[PDB]
PDB file of C-alpha atoms in Angstrom:
ATOM      1  CA  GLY A  36     106.664 142.114  76.555  1.00 50.15           C
ATOM      2  CA  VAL A  37     108.495 143.123  79.324  1.00 50.96           C
ATOM      3  CA  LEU A  38     112.135 143.405  79.703  1.00 52.23           C
ATOM      4  CA  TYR A  39     115.483 144.152  82.025  1.00 53.26           C
ATOM      5  CA  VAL A  40     118.098 145.960  80.820  1.00 49.35           C
ATOM      6  CA  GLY A  41     120.420 146.174  84.090  1.00 46.78           C
ATOM      7  CA  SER A  42     118.455 145.890  86.722  1.00 49.22           C
ATOM      8  CA  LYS A  43     117.411 144.718  90.220  1.00 48.71           C
ATOM      9  CA  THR A  44     113.722 143.713  91.315  1.00 51.74           C
ATOM     10  CA  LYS A  45     112.411 142.191  94.210  1.00 51.64           C
ATOM     11  CA  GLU A  46     108.427 141.190  93.028  1.00 49.90           C
ATOM     12  CA  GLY A  47     106.767 138.956  95.699  1.00 51.41           C
ATOM     13  CA  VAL A  48     109.491 138.385  99.004  1.00 50.66           C
ATOM     14  CA  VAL A  49     109.591 138.018 102.893  1.00 50.74           C
ATOM     15  CA  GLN A  50     113.664 138.899 103.012  1.00 55.95           C
ATOM     16  CA  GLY A  51     113.697 139.269 106.517  1.00 54.40           C
ATOM     17  CA  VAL A  52     111.132 137.668 109.865  1.00 57.71           C
ATOM     18  CA  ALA A  53     112.597 137.918 112.825  1.00 55.77           C
ATOM     19  CA  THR A  54     111.075 136.092 115.860  1.00 52.30           C
ATOM     20  CA  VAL A  55     111.418 135.864 119.629  1.00 51.88           C
ATOM     21  CA  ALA A  56     109.092 133.684 122.017  1.00 51.44           C
ATOM     22  CA  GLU A  57     109.118 132.359 124.832  1.00 51.26           C
ATOM     23  CA  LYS A  58     106.030 131.265 126.226  1.00 50.48           C
ATOM     24  CA  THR A  59     104.980 128.937 130.009  1.00 48.08           C
ATOM     25  CA  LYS A  60     101.690 127.084 129.926  1.00 42.74           C
ATOM     26  CA  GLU A  61     100.142 127.126 126.819  1.00 45.39           C
ATOM     27  CA  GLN A  62      96.728 125.593 126.100  1.00 41.52           C
ATOM     28  CA  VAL A  63      94.776 125.033 123.109  1.00 38.11           C
ATOM     29  CA  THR A  64      90.903 123.333 123.375  1.00 40.70           C
ATOM     30  CA  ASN A  65      90.283 123.582 119.353  1.00 43.18           C
ATOM     31  CA  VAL A  66      86.606 121.401 118.340  1.00 44.87           C
ATOM     32  CA  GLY A  67      86.049 121.138 114.290  1.00 45.44           C
ATOM     33  CA  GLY A  68      88.353 124.379 114.330  1.00 46.33           C
ATOM     34  CA  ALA A  69      91.094 125.864 113.046  1.00 44.70           C
ATOM     35  CA  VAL A  70      94.209 127.656 115.523  1.00 46.23           C
ATOM     36  CA  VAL A  71      97.308 129.011 114.373  1.00 46.75           C
ATOM     37  CA  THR A  72      99.953 130.296 117.039  1.00 46.06           C
ATOM     38  CA  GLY A  73     103.317 129.686 114.793  1.00 47.62           C
ATOM     39  CA  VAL A  74     105.258 131.239 111.924  1.00 49.16           C
ATOM     40  CA  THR A  75     104.227 131.451 108.919  1.00 47.47           C
ATOM     41  CA  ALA A  76     105.741 133.749 105.879  1.00 47.57           C
ATOM     42  CA  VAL A  77     104.435 132.945 102.125  1.00 49.03           C
ATOM     43  CA  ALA A  78     105.601 134.814  99.501  1.00 49.55           C
ATOM     44  CA  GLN A  79     103.581 134.996  96.011  1.00 47.27           C
ATOM     45  CA  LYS A  80     104.956 136.182  92.584  1.00 47.30           C
ATOM     46  CA  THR A  81     101.221 135.196  90.615  1.00 44.44           C
ATOM     47  CA  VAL A  82      98.039 133.768  91.291  1.00 42.94           C
ATOM     48  CA  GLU A  83      95.414 133.644  89.197  1.00 43.71           C
ATOM     49  CA  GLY A  84      91.890 132.022  89.266  1.00 41.98           C
ATOM     50  CA  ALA A  85      88.815 132.535  89.530  1.00 41.59           C
ATOM     51  CA  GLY A  86      87.257 131.921  93.297  1.00 44.04           C
ATOM     52  CA  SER A  87      90.686 131.181  93.735  1.00 48.84           C
ATOM     53  CA  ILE A  88      91.880 131.645  97.193  1.00 49.66           C
ATOM     54  CA  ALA A  89      95.899 132.017  98.014  1.00 51.80           C
ATOM     55  CA  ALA A  90      98.120 132.762 101.315  1.00 49.50           C
ATOM     56  CA  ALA A  91      95.516 131.328 103.832  1.00 50.39           C
ATOM     57  CA  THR A  92      95.976 131.364 107.972  1.00 49.35           C
ATOM     58  CA  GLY A  93      94.118 130.246 110.033  1.00 48.70           C
ATOM     59  CA  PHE A  94      91.187 129.623 107.874  1.00 49.48           C
ATOM     60  CA  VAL A  95      87.693 127.945 108.005  1.00 48.07           C
ATOM     61  CA  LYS A  96      85.817 127.302 104.892  1.00 47.69           C
ATOM     62  CA  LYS A  97      82.408 125.722 105.850  1.00 49.79           C
ATOM     63  CA  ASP A  98      80.323 126.838 102.608  1.00 53.23           C
ATOM     64  CA  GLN A  99      76.647 125.171 101.765  1.00 53.91           C
TER      65      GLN A  99
ATOM     66  CA  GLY B  36     107.573 137.543  75.647  1.00 52.57           C
ATOM     67  CA  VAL B  37     110.505 138.419  78.270  1.00 52.88           C
ATOM     68  CA  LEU B  38     114.297 139.377  77.852  1.00 50.09           C
ATOM     69  CA  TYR B  39     116.067 139.575  81.048  1.00 50.77           C
ATOM     70  CA  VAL B  40     119.879 140.972  79.445  1.00 50.35           C
ATOM     71  CA  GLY B  41     122.710 141.318  82.403  1.00 51.68           C
ATOM     72  CA  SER B  42     119.732 141.795  85.105  1.00 53.76           C
ATOM     73  CA  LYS B  43     118.883 140.259  88.676  1.00 49.70           C
ATOM     74  CA  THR B  44     115.400 139.394  89.905  1.00 50.81           C
ATOM     75  CA  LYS B  45     113.866 137.750  93.121  1.00 50.83           C
ATOM     76  CA  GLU B  46     110.488 136.206  92.270  1.00 51.19           C
ATOM     77  CA  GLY B  47     108.432 134.295  95.143  1.00 54.00           C
ATOM     78  CA  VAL B  48     110.998 133.740  97.411  1.00 50.24           C
ATOM     79  CA  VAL B  49     111.426 133.422 101.286  1.00 52.01           C
ATOM     80  CA  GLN B  50     115.306 134.856 102.164  1.00 52.09           C
ATOM     81  CA  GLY B  51     115.614 134.585 105.902  1.00 51.04           C
ATOM     82  CA  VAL B  52     113.687 133.645 108.769  1.00 48.96           C
ATOM     83  CA  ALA B  53     114.874 133.380 112.348  1.00 48.53           C
ATOM     84  CA  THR B  54     112.933 132.293 115.378  1.00 46.27           C
ATOM     85  CA  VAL B  55     113.459 131.130 119.030  1.00 49.47           C
ATOM     86  CA  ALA B  56     110.904 129.315 120.786  1.00 48.83           C
ATOM     87  CA  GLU B  57     111.441 128.469 124.492  1.00 51.91           C
ATOM     88  CA  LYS B  58     108.196 126.759 126.049  1.00 50.18           C
ATOM     89  CA  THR B  59     107.535 125.243 129.107  1.00 47.77           C
ATOM     90  CA  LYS B  60     104.302 122.407 129.476  1.00 50.17           C
ATOM     91  CA  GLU B  61     101.645 123.862 126.060  1.00 52.98           C
ATOM     92  CA  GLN B  62      99.463 120.714 125.892  1.00 56.98           C
ATOM     93  CA  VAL B  63      96.952 120.564 122.604  1.00 60.22           C
ATOM     94  CA  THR B  64      93.503 119.134 122.340  1.00 57.52           C
ATOM     95  CA  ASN B  65      92.274 118.874 119.091  1.00 60.96           C
ATOM     96  CA  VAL B  66      89.206 117.398 117.450  1.00 62.60           C
ATOM     97  CA  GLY B  67      88.194 117.127 114.252  1.00 60.42           C
ATOM     98  CA  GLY B  68      89.968 119.958 113.437  1.00 59.74           C
ATOM     99  CA  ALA B  69      93.573 122.006 112.595  1.00 59.55           C
ATOM    100  CA  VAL B  70      95.986 123.074 114.418  1.00 62.95           C
ATOM    101  CA  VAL B  71      99.308 124.844 113.346  1.00 60.91           C
ATOM    102  CA  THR B  72     102.247 125.770 116.011  1.00 61.07           C
ATOM    103  CA  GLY B  73     105.592 126.049 113.854  1.00 60.07           C
ATOM    104  CA  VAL B  74     107.149 127.643 111.201  1.00 57.37           C
ATOM    105  CA  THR B  75     106.475 128.053 107.761  1.00 56.23           C
ATOM    106  CA  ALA B  76     108.123 128.932 105.208  1.00 54.44           C
ATOM    107  CA  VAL B  77     105.868 129.100 101.313  1.00 54.12           C
ATOM    108  CA  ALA B  78     107.505 130.198  98.146  1.00 55.66           C
ATOM    109  CA  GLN B  79     106.062 129.702  95.372  1.00 55.19           C
ATOM    110  CA  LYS B  80     106.578 131.788  91.648  1.00 53.72           C
ATOM    111  CA  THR B  81     103.384 130.705  89.726  1.00 56.21           C
ATOM    112  CA  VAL B  82      99.715 129.125  90.743  1.00 57.93           C
ATOM    113  CA  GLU B  83      97.325 128.607  88.337  1.00 55.78           C
ATOM    114  CA  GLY B  84      93.726 127.579  88.866  1.00 50.87           C
ATOM    115  CA  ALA B  85      90.095 127.930  88.748  1.00 54.58           C
ATOM    116  CA  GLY B  86      89.311 127.335  92.939  1.00 54.53           C
ATOM    117  CA  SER B  87      92.794 126.242  93.315  1.00 55.28           C
ATOM    118  CA  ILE B  88      94.357 126.931  96.818  1.00 53.37           C
ATOM    119  CA  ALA B  89      97.500 127.830  97.479  1.00 51.75           C
ATOM    120  CA  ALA B  90      99.631 128.674 100.895  1.00 49.28           C
ATOM    121  CA  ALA B  91      97.396 127.153 103.166  1.00 46.24           C
ATOM    122  CA  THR B  92      98.059 126.837 106.319  1.00 46.62           C
ATOM    123  CA  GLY B  93      95.875 125.975 109.416  1.00 46.18           C
ATOM    124  CA  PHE B  94      92.485 125.419 107.480  1.00 45.53           C
ATOM    125  CA  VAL B  95      89.345 123.426 107.611  1.00 44.91           C
ATOM    126  CA  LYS B  96      87.555 123.029 104.643  1.00 45.27           C
ATOM    127  CA  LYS B  97      84.001 121.214 104.426  1.00 46.63           C
ATOM    128  CA  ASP B  98      82.086 122.558 101.369  1.00 46.08           C
ATOM    129  CA  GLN B  99      78.903 120.338 101.508  1.00 49.13           C
TER     130      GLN B  99
ATOM    131  CA  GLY C  36     109.226 132.893  73.971  1.00 49.81           C
ATOM    132  CA  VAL C  37     111.505 133.744  77.373  1.00 46.31           C
ATOM    133  CA  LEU C  38     115.294 135.234  77.144  1.00 41.70           C
ATOM    134  CA  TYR C  39     118.205 135.116  79.529  1.00 43.18           C
ATOM    135  CA  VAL C  40     121.161 137.096  79.127  1.00 42.93           C
ATOM    136  CA  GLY C  41     123.855 137.342  81.568  1.00 39.10           C
ATOM    137  CA  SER C  42     121.078 137.612  84.554  1.00 42.63           C
ATOM    138  CA  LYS C  43     120.991 136.046  87.489  1.00 45.01           C
ATOM    139  CA  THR C  44     117.509 134.890  88.520  1.00 45.54           C
ATOM    140  CA  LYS C  45     116.006 133.283  91.594  1.00 44.01           C
ATOM    141  CA  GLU C  46     111.873 132.196  91.503  1.00 41.44           C
ATOM    142  CA  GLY C  47     110.024 130.033  93.871  1.00 43.33           C
ATOM    143  CA  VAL C  48     113.238 129.296  96.603  1.00 46.08           C
ATOM    144  CA  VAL C  49     113.638 129.061 100.283  1.00 46.52           C
ATOM    145  CA  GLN C  50     116.680 130.564 100.980  1.00 47.32           C
ATOM    146  CA  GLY C  51     117.871 130.759 104.991  1.00 45.60           C
ATOM    147  CA  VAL C  52     115.706 129.383 107.899  1.00 45.51           C
ATOM    148  CA  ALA C  53     117.226 129.219 111.160  1.00 50.04           C
ATOM    149  CA  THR C  54     114.572 128.235 114.482  1.00 53.95           C
ATOM    150  CA  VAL C  55     115.586 127.213 117.507  1.00 53.66           C
ATOM    151  CA  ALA C  56     113.214 125.363 119.708  1.00 49.77           C
ATOM    152  CA  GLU C  57     113.407 124.222 123.849  1.00 49.15           C
ATOM    153  CA  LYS C  58     110.620 122.868 124.627  1.00 48.15           C
ATOM    154  CA  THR C  59     109.246 121.349 128.059  1.00 46.52           C
ATOM    155  CA  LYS C  60     106.828 118.733 128.395  1.00 46.34           C
ATOM    156  CA  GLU C  61     104.385 118.765 125.602  1.00 49.62           C
ATOM    157  CA  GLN C  62     101.114 116.592 124.712  1.00 52.74           C
ATOM    158  CA  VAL C  63      99.323 116.281 121.595  1.00 49.71           C
ATOM    159  CA  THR C  64      95.935 114.392 121.962  1.00 46.19           C
ATOM    160  CA  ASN C  65      94.742 114.548 117.932  1.00 46.51           C
ATOM    161  CA  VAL C  66      91.290 112.402 117.254  1.00 44.58           C
ATOM    162  CA  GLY C  67      90.162 112.975 113.865  1.00 44.86           C
ATOM    163  CA  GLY C  68      92.695 116.026 112.984  1.00 43.57           C
ATOM    164  CA  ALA C  69      95.713 117.500 111.732  1.00 47.62           C
ATOM    165  CA  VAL C  70      98.296 118.450 114.327  1.00 49.35           C
ATOM    166  CA  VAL C  71     101.500 120.405 112.439  1.00 50.39           C
ATOM    167  CA  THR C  72     104.186 121.557 115.053  1.00 53.17           C
ATOM    168  CA  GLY C  73     107.377 121.777 113.386  1.00 53.04           C
ATOM    169  CA  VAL C  74     109.206 123.415 110.554  1.00 54.62           C
ATOM    170  CA  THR C  75     107.773 123.241 106.497  1.00 52.93           C
ATOM    171  CA  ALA C  76     109.988 125.177 103.949  1.00 52.89           C
ATOM    172  CA  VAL C  77     108.152 124.624 101.080  1.00 51.52           C
ATOM    173  CA  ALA C  78     109.155 126.105  97.515  1.00 52.12           C
ATOM    174  CA  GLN C  79     107.526 125.920  93.925  1.00 50.15           C
ATOM    175  CA  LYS C  80     108.217 127.380  90.170  1.00 45.57           C
ATOM    176  CA  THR C  81     104.915 126.483  88.957  1.00 45.89           C
ATOM    177  CA  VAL C  82     101.948 124.840  89.732  1.00 46.65           C
ATOM    178  CA  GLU C  83      98.549 124.522  87.645  1.00 44.84           C
ATOM    179  CA  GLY C  84      95.618 123.203  87.757  1.00 46.33           C
ATOM    180  CA  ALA C  85      92.124 123.171  88.410  1.00 45.84           C
ATOM    181  CA  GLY C  86      90.738 122.623  91.967  1.00 48.73           C
ATOM    182  CA  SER C  87      94.661 122.275  92.672  1.00 50.61           C
ATOM    183  CA  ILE C  88      96.000 122.707  96.253  1.00 49.90           C
ATOM    184  CA  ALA C  89      99.644 123.151  96.583  1.00 47.83           C
ATOM    185  CA  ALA C  90     101.150 124.081 100.498  1.00 48.15           C
ATOM    186  CA  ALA C  91      99.233 122.849 102.219  1.00 50.36           C
ATOM    187  CA  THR C  92     100.285 122.538 106.259  1.00 53.51           C
ATOM    188  CA  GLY C  93      98.498 121.375 108.676  1.00 56.10           C
ATOM    189  CA  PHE C  94      94.672 120.886 106.093  1.00 55.48           C
ATOM    190  CA  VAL C  95      91.554 118.934 106.960  1.00 53.72           C
ATOM    191  CA  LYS C  96      89.300 118.543 103.797  1.00 53.78           C
ATOM    192  CA  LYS C  97      86.150 117.172 104.192  1.00 52.56           C
ATOM    193  CA  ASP C  98      84.390 117.750 100.953  1.00 58.06           C
ATOM    194  CA  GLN C  99      80.746 116.853 100.336  1.00 57.60           C
TER     195      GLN C  99
ATOM    196  CA  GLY D  36     105.225 147.023  77.095  1.00 55.51           C
ATOM    197  CA  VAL D  37     107.181 146.987  80.484  1.00 54.57           C
ATOM    198  CA  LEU D  38     110.775 148.114  79.993  1.00 56.06           C
ATOM    199  CA  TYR D  39     113.138 148.671  82.935  1.00 55.48           C
ATOM    200  CA  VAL D  40     116.864 149.996  81.848  1.00 54.83           C
ATOM    201  CA  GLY D  41     119.356 150.216  84.914  1.00 54.14           C
ATOM    202  CA  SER D  42     116.592 150.286  88.180  1.00 53.73           C
ATOM    203  CA  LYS D  43     116.102 149.137  91.312  1.00 52.54           C
ATOM    204  CA  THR D  44     112.753 148.065  92.046  1.00 54.42           C
ATOM    205  CA  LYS D  45     110.958 146.851  94.747  1.00 53.65           C
ATOM    206  CA  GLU D  46     107.151 145.571  94.235  1.00 54.12           C
ATOM    207  CA  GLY D  47     105.083 143.184  96.553  1.00 58.22           C
ATOM    208  CA  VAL D  48     107.705 142.205  99.554  1.00 53.89           C
ATOM    209  CA  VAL D  49     108.106 142.286 103.265  1.00 52.49           C
ATOM    210  CA  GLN D  50     111.687 143.417 104.366  1.00 55.92           C
ATOM    211  CA  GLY D  51     111.768 143.435 108.302  1.00 56.53           C
ATOM    212  CA  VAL D  52     109.699 142.399 110.890  1.00 56.42           C
ATOM    213  CA  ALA D  53     110.823 141.488 114.503  1.00 54.75           C
ATOM    214  CA  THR D  54     108.884 140.427 117.175  1.00 57.70           C
ATOM    215  CA  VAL D  55     109.184 139.963 120.592  1.00 57.21           C
ATOM    216  CA  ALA D  56     106.417 137.919 122.725  1.00 59.33           C
ATOM    217  CA  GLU D  57     107.030 137.018 126.100  1.00 59.17           C
ATOM    218  CA  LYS D  58     103.704 135.385 127.396  1.00 59.93           C
ATOM    219  CA  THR D  59     102.858 133.241 130.395  1.00 61.49           C
ATOM    220  CA  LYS D  60      99.469 131.787 130.659  1.00 61.52           C
ATOM    221  CA  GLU D  61      97.377 131.809 127.550  1.00 58.91           C
ATOM    222  CA  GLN D  62      94.642 129.000 126.572  1.00 57.87           C
ATOM    223  CA  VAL D  63      92.599 128.858 123.808  1.00 57.31           C
ATOM    224  CA  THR D  64      89.522 127.512 123.122  1.00 56.80           C
ATOM    225  CA  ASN D  65      87.966 127.801 119.500  1.00 58.63           C
ATOM    226  CA  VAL D  66      84.928 125.512 118.922  1.00 60.24           C
ATOM    227  CA  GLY D  67      83.876 125.779 114.721  1.00 61.70           C
ATOM    228  CA  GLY D  68      85.807 128.927 114.461  1.00 59.31           C
ATOM    229  CA  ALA D  69      89.574 130.488 113.602  1.00 56.43           C
ATOM    230  CA  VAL D  70      91.816 131.637 115.602  1.00 54.40           C
ATOM    231  CA  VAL D  71      95.895 133.324 114.508  1.00 54.04           C
ATOM    232  CA  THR D  72      97.846 134.570 117.990  1.00 55.25           C
ATOM    233  CA  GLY D  73     101.282 133.976 116.392  1.00 55.64           C
ATOM    234  CA  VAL D  74     103.097 136.369 113.598  1.00 57.82           C
ATOM    235  CA  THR D  75     102.290 136.227 109.447  1.00 57.14           C
ATOM    236  CA  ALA D  76     104.227 137.823 106.346  1.00 55.36           C
ATOM    237  CA  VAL D  77     102.580 137.083 103.286  1.00 56.57           C
ATOM    238  CA  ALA D  78     103.851 138.816 100.041  1.00 61.26           C
ATOM    239  CA  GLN D  79     102.405 138.886  96.615  1.00 63.87           C
ATOM    240  CA  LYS D  80     103.100 140.460  93.390  1.00 64.34           C
ATOM    241  CA  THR D  81      99.636 140.007  91.174  1.00 68.01           C
ATOM    242  CA  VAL D  82      96.834 138.231  91.700  1.00 68.05           C
ATOM    243  CA  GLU D  83      94.049 137.757  89.930  1.00 67.03           C
ATOM    244  CA  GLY D  84      90.236 136.227  89.874  1.00 67.90           C
ATOM    245  CA  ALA D  85      86.935 136.598  90.304  1.00 69.74           C
ATOM    246  CA  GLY D  86      85.643 136.229  93.976  1.00 72.48           C
ATOM    247  CA  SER D  87      89.233 135.174  94.950  1.00 70.47           C
ATOM    248  CA  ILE D  88      90.868 135.567  98.077  1.00 72.82           C
ATOM    249  CA  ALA D  89      94.101 136.675  99.355  1.00 76.93           C
ATOM    250  CA  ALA D  90      95.911 137.238 102.437  1.00 72.36           C
ATOM    251  CA  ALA D  91      93.015 135.882 104.088  1.00 75.31           C
ATOM    252  CA  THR D  92      94.205 135.683 108.324  1.00 76.78           C
ATOM    253  CA  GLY D  93      91.669 134.481 110.357  1.00 76.30           C
ATOM    254  CA  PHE D  94      88.862 133.727 108.197  1.00 78.48           C
ATOM    255  CA  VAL D  95      85.767 132.121 108.455  1.00 80.28           C
ATOM    256  CA  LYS D  96      83.749 131.910 105.347  1.00 81.90           C
ATOM    257  CA  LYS D  97      80.331 129.909 105.575  1.00 77.96           C
ATOM    258  CA  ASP D  98      78.667 131.422 102.143  1.00 76.81           C
ATOM    259  CA  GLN D  99      75.257 129.813 101.657  1.00 79.84           C
TER     260      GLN D  99
ATOM    261  CA  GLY E  36     103.557 151.419  78.193  1.00 80.62           C
ATOM    262  CA  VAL E  37     105.887 152.253  81.643  1.00 81.53           C
ATOM    263  CA  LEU E  38     109.371 152.896  80.837  1.00 82.55           C
ATOM    264  CA  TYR E  39     111.996 153.303  84.214  1.00 82.75           C
ATOM    265  CA  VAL E  40     115.176 154.948  82.864  1.00 85.87           C
ATOM    266  CA  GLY E  41     117.399 154.824  86.387  1.00 86.52           C
ATOM    267  CA  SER E  42     115.078 154.630  88.870  1.00 85.26           C
ATOM    268  CA  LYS E  43     114.386 153.711  92.290  1.00 88.40           C
ATOM    269  CA  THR E  44     110.837 152.601  93.178  1.00 89.95           C
ATOM    270  CA  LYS E  45     109.130 150.628  96.202  1.00 90.58           C
ATOM    271  CA  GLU E  46     105.194 149.689  95.613  1.00 93.65           C
ATOM    272  CA  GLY E  47     103.221 148.047  97.845  1.00 89.62           C
ATOM    273  CA  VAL E  48     105.879 146.701 100.564  1.00 88.05           C
ATOM    274  CA  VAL E  49     105.499 146.880 104.098  1.00 87.56           C
ATOM    275  CA  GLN E  50     109.571 147.505 105.226  1.00 89.81           C
ATOM    276  CA  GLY E  51     109.956 147.829 108.688  1.00 92.71           C
ATOM    277  CA  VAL E  52     107.663 146.591 111.529  1.00 90.45           C
ATOM    278  CA  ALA E  53     108.986 145.778 115.499  1.00 92.17           C
ATOM    279  CA  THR E  54     106.904 145.715 117.718  1.00 87.47           C
ATOM    280  CA  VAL E  55     107.157 143.808 121.806  1.00 87.29           C
ATOM    281  CA  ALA E  56     104.318 142.116 123.614  1.00 87.11           C
ATOM    282  CA  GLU E  57     104.186 141.219 126.950  1.00 90.12           C
ATOM    283  CA  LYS E  58     100.879 139.350 128.063  1.00 91.15           C
ATOM    284  CA  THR E  59     100.034 137.377 131.263  1.00 90.02           C
ATOM    285  CA  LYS E  60      97.619 135.503 131.333  1.00 88.39           C
ATOM    286  CA  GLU E  61      94.893 135.864 128.291  1.00 88.72           C
ATOM    287  CA  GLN E  62      92.302 133.306 127.770  1.00 89.76           C
ATOM    288  CA  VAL E  63      90.450 133.722 124.554  1.00 92.55           C
ATOM    289  CA  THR E  64      87.089 132.008 123.971  1.00 94.77           C
ATOM    290  CA  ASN E  65      85.749 132.040 120.527  1.00 94.81           C
ATOM    291  CA  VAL E  66      82.416 130.580 119.250  1.00 93.87           C
ATOM    292  CA  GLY E  67      82.201 130.150 115.372  1.00 95.85           C
ATOM    293  CA  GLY E  68      84.222 133.274 115.430  1.00 95.04           C
ATOM    294  CA  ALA E  69      87.419 134.554 114.078  1.00 98.10           C
ATOM    295  CA  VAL E  70      89.779 136.225 116.597  1.00 98.44           C
ATOM    296  CA  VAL E  71      93.224 137.603 115.219  1.00 98.12           C
ATOM    297  CA  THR E  72      95.789 138.855 118.480  1.00 98.10           C
ATOM    298  CA  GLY E  73      99.214 138.599 116.246  1.00 99.00           C
ATOM    299  CA  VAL E  74     101.583 140.588 114.014  1.00102.17           C
ATOM    300  CA  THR E  75     100.027 139.939 110.197  1.00101.14           C
ATOM    301  CA  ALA E  76     102.387 142.262 107.211  1.00100.21           C
ATOM    302  CA  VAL E  77     100.568 142.065 104.115  1.00102.25           C
ATOM    303  CA  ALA E  78     102.298 143.635 100.403  1.00101.91           C
ATOM    304  CA  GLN E  79     100.650 143.518  97.672  1.00 99.71           C
ATOM    305  CA  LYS E  80     101.177 144.606  94.080  1.00100.84           C
ATOM    306  CA  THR E  81      98.190 144.290  92.405  1.00 98.18           C
ATOM    307  CA  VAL E  82      95.054 142.397  92.953  1.00100.16           C
ATOM    308  CA  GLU E  83      91.671 142.246  90.326  1.00102.35           C
ATOM    309  CA  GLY E  84      88.812 140.561  90.532  1.00105.77           C
ATOM    310  CA  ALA E  85      84.890 141.106  90.698  1.00106.23           C
ATOM    311  CA  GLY E  86      83.975 141.017  94.417  1.00104.18           C
ATOM    312  CA  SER E  87      87.607 139.884  95.317  1.00102.07           C
ATOM    313  CA  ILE E  88      89.116 140.151  98.880  1.00104.95           C
ATOM    314  CA  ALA E  89      92.331 141.244  99.805  1.00104.40           C
ATOM    315  CA  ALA E  90      94.371 141.809 103.154  1.00104.20           C
ATOM    316  CA  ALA E  91      91.281 140.395 104.975  1.00103.12           C
ATOM    317  CA  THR E  92      92.557 139.763 108.990  1.00101.62           C
ATOM    318  CA  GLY E  93      89.757 139.205 111.449  1.00100.72           C
ATOM    319  CA  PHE E  94      87.234 138.653 108.803  1.00 99.93           C
ATOM    320  CA  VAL E  95      83.295 136.500 109.609  1.00103.10           C
ATOM    321  CA  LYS E  96      81.332 136.648 105.953  1.00105.08           C
ATOM    322  CA  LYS E  97      78.286 134.131 106.084  1.00107.44           C
ATOM    323  CA  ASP E  98      76.497 136.120 102.864  1.00106.10           C
ATOM    324  CA  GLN E  99      73.236 134.654 101.828  1.00106.84           C
TER     325      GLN E  99
END
């Protein structure tokens, strides 16, 4: 039982992200891997689950 | 039981993302991998599931 | 049981994304992989499922 | 039982991130690994699950 | 039982992060590892789970 009366609520939010990126001559060599060089904003209220993965950035998974 | 009376609620939201990117001469060489160099905004309220993956950016999965 | 009376709610939304990208001479060489260099906005309310994948960007999956 | 009467609450939020990055000549060589050199904002209200992973950035998992 | 009457509460939030980074000639060589050189903001209200990992940055896990 959850009751909101005349309230304001922010749950799991990204409000404001501002990025200025100036880059000259980048080179990326990736063999069998993961490379992230950008801007990533992830907002989630509820994630439920055994062994679950939520908000993974630059992730290499090789479970045996 | 969930009841909202005269309320304002933001749940799982990305509001404002502003990016300026100036790049001269990038080269990307990727063999059997994942490379992310952009802008990614992901907003999700509810994700449910065993072994579930939600909001994966630049992800290499090779489970055996 | 979910009841909204005179309320305002935002659930799983991306509101505003603004990107300026100036790029001279990019070259992308990709062999058997995934490369993402754009702008990606994903908004989802509810995703349910075992082993489910939601909002995957730049994802290489080779499970055996 | 959770009741909010005339209240303002922020739960699991990233409000404001501002980054200025000037980079000349970066080169990234990655073999079977994970490299993250960007801007990552992750906001989540509730994550529940055995062995769960939430908000992983630059993560290499090779469990046997 | 949790009751908020006319209150203001911030729980699990990152408010303001400002970074200026000027870098000339960085090179990153990573073999079977994890390297993080960016800006990472993670805000989470509640994470529950045995053996759970939340807010891992630059993490190598090879449990046997």
